[PDB]
Structure formats: structure tokens, C-alpha cells
Amino acid sequence: MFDFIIDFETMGSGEKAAVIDLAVIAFDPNPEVVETFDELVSRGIKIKFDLKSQKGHRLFTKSTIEWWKNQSPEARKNIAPSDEDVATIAGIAKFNDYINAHNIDPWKSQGWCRGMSFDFPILVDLIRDIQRLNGVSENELDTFKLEPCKFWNQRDIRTRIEALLLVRDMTTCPLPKGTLDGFVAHDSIHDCAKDILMMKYALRYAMGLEDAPSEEECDPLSLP
Amino acid sequence: MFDFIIDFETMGSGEKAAVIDLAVIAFDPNPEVVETFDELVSRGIKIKFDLKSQKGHRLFTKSTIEWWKNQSPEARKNIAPSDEDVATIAGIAKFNDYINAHNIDPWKSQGWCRGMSFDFPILVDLIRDIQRLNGVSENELDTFKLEPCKFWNQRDIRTRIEALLLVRDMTTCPLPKGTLDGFVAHDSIHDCAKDILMMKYALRYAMGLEDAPSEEECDPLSLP
Known part of the structure; x- marks a missing residue:
């Protein structure tokens, strides 16, 4: 049973915001399982949208x-636009295929993003396009079965990390030295990988499965 | 400096959902203060919306x-319809008045709801309405200075309580006897006060400020 992360790049703010890309990675919530950067990045996909068509x-x-x-x-x-851009209806199909292929339980998995009010409402609006394409009226939309997790199982990354570390306004988490070796700053998949790692290590510290490294003893990329 | 909690009742799902009411309570984030149920309720307000106008x-x-x-x-x-029903612009004005009268810092206070992707997008769509009322085009909306907290200060109650207690899928917190004395089922303000209280005590049980009551020695209105 894997959980998953999602992250949108957009040209606007509400649930109808034009979307630039969508990165997603499934991961293991087990606190004793510490999935590393490279395997997280490898398990991940990046769905890139054609902006003009929106x-x-x-x-x-x-x-x-x-x-x-x-x-x-x-x-x-x-x-920037590239030849890997896909229409949004093709992108959400790719998104569903990844979920179905990556050990996600529709009733027990959790979905995570850095600000629930931002990514999940867009995600759901895109899934609703699946029903709109099938002629469903807006007031009869019902995507309960099409969604990758149950709505009560969405989870907010800022709230998780801040609560795990008991420090108000602290939404990042220091990782041991070299944990983020190979990071490329504006790689959508990497960003989600670093957030997955920061949430796992926050879980280990708050349980007591390892200790928080020092400022001079941790990968500086993890430092806000 | 207080934090606040919100909660809609709706007839709908997305950010454009028809709203029934909106409860909001400003409250003290500090762990060492345990505010009572009676003062939380007495500080709360409830805005009830006119359904027919929507x-x-x-x-x-x-x-x-x-x-x-x-x-x-x-x-x-x-x-059911009621004499206290207000138009949605009227209720968002009332919401903004309540926020302005209750020691909320725009840059530092944190806003809370049970399901960040549900209430905050509806709140923000109602605040957007203020800007459309002023003749602003959809593609030029910008509610950043009108929102009651900054978007990165939105916080999810399910994620919080589950993080503080360290039990997957546990989104309620047991409360010491009599904590919910006076609770009335289906009172919008009462529900928010319960959630404020459950979040506070979960913080206290995580910080060691108190030990959690036993499942037999807790207020039974706090059980699953």
C-alpha cells in the first residue's frame, strides 16, 4: 500500500487554473522504510501540458x-512549450494510469501536496473533465470513484511537517548530509522527491528513529 | 494574535458550491492556554446563507x-430557509468584519478547516466575488490582500490531529471528561469549538503537557 505526492505548475490560482505540468510520485509511508532520492525520482513521472490549447x-x-x-x-x-506537451484530457488519463499501476488503494492510500487547497482542487477539476467529456452536467458531476484517494484522505504537507517538528511556521525539514545529491533546482519530479524525504525524516525524528542533524551536519539544500 | 477555524455547510462540491452556512471562530494557538468550550462557542459566529439567491x-x-x-x-x-439568511456578498462582508475584529494578523495567523481543499477554495471564491463586484475580469482577479490568512498559512485539521497523535487515519482526539459539556448536535459553532479543542489537546498530548484520558475516562462525545 503506497501513498502519493502531486504538484502542479500553473498560470493561475483557482480550480480552473491553466496547468503547466503535474508531477506525481508513489512512496512508502512506513516510517522504518527510508526510500532514497534516486529511487523516488525514478518511480516518479512528470505530466506536461500544452498551454495554448487551454x-x-x-x-x-x-x-x-x-x-x-x-x-x-x-x-x-x-x-516552456515542448513536444512532450499533452492536452489536459490526455494528461489526466496518464495520471490515472500511473495511480492504477502503482499500488494505490482507493480507500486507504493518502494523497499529499504542498497546500491542499491548491493542487487537489485543480486535480479534481481535471478529473471532472473526464465526466464532462461523457456529457455529464456540472450539477450532476460525481467523481467519488474516479479520484485517486478518498477526499478525507488528502493530506497537507505544510501541516504535516510543522506538526511533526512542533515548530510553528516550519514547513521544511533538514535531511542528513548529502541526502539530496543530484538535485536539479527546477525539476518538477525532484521537488516532489525532496518533499517526500522531508516528510519521512520528520516522521522518524518525531517517533525517535534518528536524530535531527546539525546545521553543519545536514545537506544544505534541506535548509529553508 | 489569534488563529481561526472555518466550516461551510454546502449543497455542492467544488469551489462554486452553493453554501448553506459558514461558522468561524477565532482562537488562541498557544498550547498552555486551554480555552473552554463555552468561551469558544460564545466567541464564534455563524453566517447563514440565502439558498434561493444562489x-x-x-x-x-x-x-x-x-x-x-x-x-x-x-x-x-x-x-431550511430562515430570517437570518444573507446574500453571499453580505456574508463574506460579515466574515471579513469578524476577522478584522478578532486579533488576526494577516501575515502570521493560521486558518484551519476539516479538509483544506474544501472550505478554503469556497472562501476564496466568495472573496473573489468582491473583486468581480468591482468589475474585475476573471483573468485579473487578485485577492491576496483580501484573504484572512496568507495562502501558505492555511492548515488542515485532519493532517494536524493525525500528525500530533502519530496514528494513521486518526483525525479526532479524546478529551478529558466534561470538556464537551453542553454540546448540541448539528450546531455549526459547536462543531468548530470541538475541532479547536481536539486540536489543542492533541498538541498537549504531543508536548507532554498532559496525558491523554483513557477511552473509558474521556468525554464520550470525542470518541470515533
């Missing part, structure tokens, strides 16, 4: 367009 | 209507 269908917020304009050249590159 | 504007989901059809008559009484 014009007229999804929401390009201008305060987000400008935000992207000011970001770094390598961050802007990761979000 | 027909054609907000989403009435068939399966949510059917789920309401099957609740007890006590639960359904809260749904």
Missing part, C-alpha cells in the same frame, strides 16, 4: 503570468 | 442534495 478553456491569471516573467531563466525554461 | 449562480450538486435528503430531521432543520 486558451479559452482554463484560467490565465495575469498576476501569475507576470510572476513567471520575472523568474529565473532555468525556471522559465522548465515551463 | 440558483443560477452557485452549484447545487445532485449527490450532495441526495446526501442531505437522508440526514436526520435535526440535521435538516439547519438547512
Whole structure:
């Protein structure tokens, strides 16, 4: 029984926000199982969307367009159009296929993102497109069976880590030295891998299966 | 500096969902203060929405209507129209007034709901309505200064309680005897006060400030 992480890059903010990419990784919640960076990254997939086709269908917020304009050249590159872009209806199909193929229990697994109010409402809006394509009226939408986890099993990453470490406003977690060797800063799959690791080590410390390293004794990439 | 909790009752699922009421309670995050049920309730407010005014504007989901059809008559009484009903712009104004009168810091306070992907997107869609009321286009909405907490300060109650107690899928917390004395079933404000109390004590049981009551020696309104 694996859990999973998801993370969207978008051009807007609400549940109809134009989506740039969607990274997802299944992982083992067992506190004594410490899945490493490389295997997490390898198990993960990145679904990349065709932005143009969402014009007229999804929401390009201008305060987000400008935000992207000011970001770094390598961050802007990761979000440029490429030949791997897929329509959103193809992307959500790929997303469901990954879940069905990766030991996710529809009733017992948990889904995680860095801000539940952001990724899950978009995810669900995309899954609702699956029913809209099949002619379902908006007020008759019912995606309870199509969703990758039960809604009461979505989980917020900021809330988890902050609660595990008992430090208000602390939503990252230091990892032992070299845990993030091979990290590429604007690789969607890596970002989810680091968040998976930070949540596992927070779980081990709060249980007492290892101790929090020092500032000079931990991978500096894990340090806010 | 207080934190706050919110909770809608709705007739719908997405961010456009038809709203029935909105309970909100400002409360003290500090562990060493245990505020009583009676003062939490007395600090809370309930905004009840006029359902008829939302027909054609907000989403009435068939399966949510059917789920309401099957609740007890006590639960359904809260749904019926009432003299205290307000238009959605009126209720979001009242919500903003309550937040402004109750020691909430925009940059530091944390907002709480049972299911971050449910209430906060509806809250934000109601606040967006303020900007559409001003003639702002959908693609130029920007509610960042209007939101009661910053988006990264939203927090999920299910994730919190489960993290503090270290039991997978345990989203309630046992309370010492008499803690819920006075609880009235299906009172929107009472439910939020219960959740504030369950979050506080879960923090205390994690910090060693008290030991959890035994399943026989706890308030039975806190059991699963």
C-alpha cells in the first residue's frame, strides 16, 4: 500500500487554473522504510501540458503570468512549450494510469501536496473533465470513484511537517548530509522527491528513529 | 494574535458550491492556554446563507442534495430557509468584519478547516466575488490582500490531529471528561469549538503537557 505526492505548475490560482505540468510520485509511508532520492525520482513521472490549447478553456491569471516573467531563466525554461506537451484530457488519463499501476488503494492510500487547497482542487477539476467529456452536467458531476484517494484522505504537507517538528511556521525539514545529491533546482519530479524525504525524516525524528542533524551536519539544500 | 477555524455547510462540491452556512471562530494557538468550550462557542459566529439567491449562480450538486435528503430531521432543520439568511456578498462582508475584529494578523495567523481543499477554495471564491463586484475580469482577479490568512498559512485539521497523535487515519482526539459539556448536535459553532479543542489537546498530548484520558475516562462525545 503506497501513498502519493502531486504538484502542479500553473498560470493561475483557482480550480480552473491553466496547468503547466503535474508531477506525481508513489512512496512508502512506513516510517522504518527510508526510500532514497534516486529511487523516488525514478518511480516518479512528470505530466506536461500544452498551454495554448487551454486558451479559452482554463484560467490565465495575469498576476501569475507576470510572476513567471520575472523568474529565473532555468525556471522559465522548465515551463516552456515542448513536444512532450499533452492536452489536459490526455494528461489526466496518464495520471490515472500511473495511480492504477502503482499500488494505490482507493480507500486507504493518502494523497499529499504542498497546500491542499491548491493542487487537489485543480486535480479534481481535471478529473471532472473526464465526466464532462461523457456529457455529464456540472450539477450532476460525481467523481467519488474516479479520484485517486478518498477526499478525507488528502493530506497537507505544510501541516504535516510543522506538526511533526512542533515548530510553528516550519514547513521544511533538514535531511542528513548529502541526502539530496543530484538535485536539479527546477525539476518538477525532484521537488516532489525532496518533499517526500522531508516528510519521512520528520516522521522518524518525531517517533525517535534518528536524530535531527546539525546545521553543519545536514545537506544544505534541506535548509529553508 | 489569534488563529481561526472555518466550516461551510454546502449543497455542492467544488469551489462554486452553493453554501448553506459558514461558522468561524477565532482562537488562541498557544498550547498552555486551554480555552473552554463555552468561551469558544460564545466567541464564534455563524453566517447563514440565502439558498434561493444562489440558483443560477452557485452549484447545487445532485449527490450532495441526495446526501442531505437522508440526514436526520435535526440535521435538516439547519438547512431550511430562515430570517437570518444573507446574500453571499453580505456574508463574506460579515466574515471579513469578524476577522478584522478578532486579533488576526494577516501575515502570521493560521486558518484551519476539516479538509483544506474544501472550505478554503469556497472562501476564496466568495472573496473573489468582491473583486468581480468591482468589475474585475476573471483573468485579473487578485485577492491576496483580501484573504484572512496568507495562502501558505492555511492548515488542515485532519493532517494536524493525525500528525500530533502519530496514528494513521486518526483525525479526532479524546478529551478529558466534561470538556464537551453542553454540546448540541448539528450546531455549526459547536462543531468548530470541538475541532479547536481536539486540536489543542492533541498538541498537549504531543508536548507532554498532559496525558491523554483513557477511552473509558474521556468525554464520550470525542470518541470515533
